[PDB]
Amino acid sequence: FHRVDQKEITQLSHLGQGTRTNVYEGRLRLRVVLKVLDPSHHDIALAFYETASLMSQVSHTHLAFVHGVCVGPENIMVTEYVEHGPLDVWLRRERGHVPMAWKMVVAQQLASALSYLENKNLVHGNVCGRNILLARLGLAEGTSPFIKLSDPGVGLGALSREERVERIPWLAPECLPTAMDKWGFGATLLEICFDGEAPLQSRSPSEKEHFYQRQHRLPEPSCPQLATLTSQCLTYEPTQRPSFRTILRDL
Numbered sequence: 001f002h003r004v005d006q007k008e009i010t011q012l013s014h015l016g017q018g019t020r021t022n023v024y025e026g027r028l029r030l031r032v033v034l035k036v037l038d039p040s041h042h043d044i045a046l047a048f049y050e051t052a053s054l055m056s057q058v059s060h061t062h063l064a065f066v067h068g069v070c071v072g073p074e075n076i077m078v079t080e081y082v083e084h085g086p087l088d089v090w091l092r093r094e095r096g097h098v099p100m101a102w103k104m105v106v107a108q109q110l111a112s113a114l115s116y117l118e119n120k121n122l123v124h125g126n127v128c129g130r131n132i133l134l135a136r137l138g139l140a141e142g143t144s145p146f147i148k149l150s151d152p153g154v155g156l157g158a159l160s161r162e163e164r165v166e167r168i169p170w171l172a173p174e175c176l177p178t179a180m181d182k183w184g185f186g187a188t189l190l191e192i193c194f195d196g197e198a199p200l201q202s203r204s205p206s207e208k209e210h211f212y213q214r215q216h217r218l219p220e221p222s223c224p225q226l227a228t229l230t231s232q233c234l235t236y237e238p239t240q241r242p243s244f245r246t247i248l249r250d251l
């Protein structure tokens with residue numbers, strides 16, 4: 001990854017929070033986003049650098065760009081500013097008015113980005129609607145949506161059990177104690193089908209953990225065109241999950 005000097009960046013409005021981060025709009029001497037890591041232990045900073053490294057070594061139409069990292073107790077990932085923000089937020093605002101054909105384009109674009117990652121034997125590890133950014137809305141007639149899958153933030157391996165429980169239903173059950181992205185992908189399809197209302201999201205940490213410990217399965221989507229696909233992706237057996245080559249073909 002590229003090293004960014006603090007003199008080259010300007011920090012503007014707070015956009016929201018990530019895991020152990022604060023996301024701000026900014027300027028790079030370009031409009032960008034600044035992912036400000038909380039004061040952290042070296043294991044966390046390392047997991048943050050590993051993400052910036054992974055995202056700086058990849059290039060795909062549906063993957064967000066990483067400009068670099070600015071490093072005292074402050075670690076800032078300088079990443080792509082995407083026009084319309086998170087998919088989950090947009091789906092809730094547009095609830096009941098999002099056509100099936102629009103959802104199918106998003107699913108295909110997401111499967112495309114994940115197939116590219118799969119071919120290179122790389123793991124994203126944080127696939128959810130929140131990390132899917134809308135570059136184009138595709139609301140006007142003769143237009144379609146355009147997504148950018150955001151960087152996964154602090155790597156999954158560096159997070160606490162409490163943080164992994166907070167990631168349910170997107171977290172693969174084998175991660176509770178490349179196949180994990182197939183589950184993340186399936187849970188994201190359900191979330192898209194239910195207009196940004198993910199299953200179990202409202203439930204308590206104890207309830208979410210019990211759901212996985214008791215091996216319960218996630219609901220079927222309201223969209224029948226994705227029922228088989230989500231059932232195949234959301235199996236507790238990682239080896240039984242289809243490849244993104246198969247998913248992309250089946251879409």
Ligand SMILES: CNc1cc(Nc2cccn(-c3ccc(C#N)cc3)c2=O)nn2c(C(=O)NC3CC3)cnc12
Nearest residue numbers: 015016017023033080081082083084085086130131150
């Ligand atoms: C216009 N452009 C952008 C806006 C934006 N906003 C938010 C960031 C974080 C949380 N929330 C949020 C959710 C829910 C609530 C509530 N309630 C409040 C804030 C956002 O809205 N994030 N973002 C990124 C990006 O990489 N963000 C990382 C998440 C991946 C890139 N461009 C943009």
